[PDB]
Amino acid sequence: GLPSGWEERKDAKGRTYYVNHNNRTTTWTRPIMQL
Amino acid sequence: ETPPPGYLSEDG
């Protein structure tokens, strides 16, 4: 489940994160924008 | 957990 409007990167350092262009954010949190 | 990489820099 990925929301169109952020890019995501699942890094093997044991943490995946989503970047929102709409709010300018880098976060572990699952995007609510998605619904 | 060591935190997030800076915002909007995405190597694809």
Side-chain angles (χ1 to χ4, degrees), chain B:
Chain B
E1 311 305 279
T2 25
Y7 150 78
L8 270 180
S9 173
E10 303 288 276
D11 293 289

Side-chain angles (χ1 to χ4, degrees), chain A residues 2-13:
Chain A
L2 204 70
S4 305
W6 317 25
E7 318 309 298
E8 72 114 82
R9 284 197 297 142
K10 205 157 294 78
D11 193 285
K13 71 197 201 84

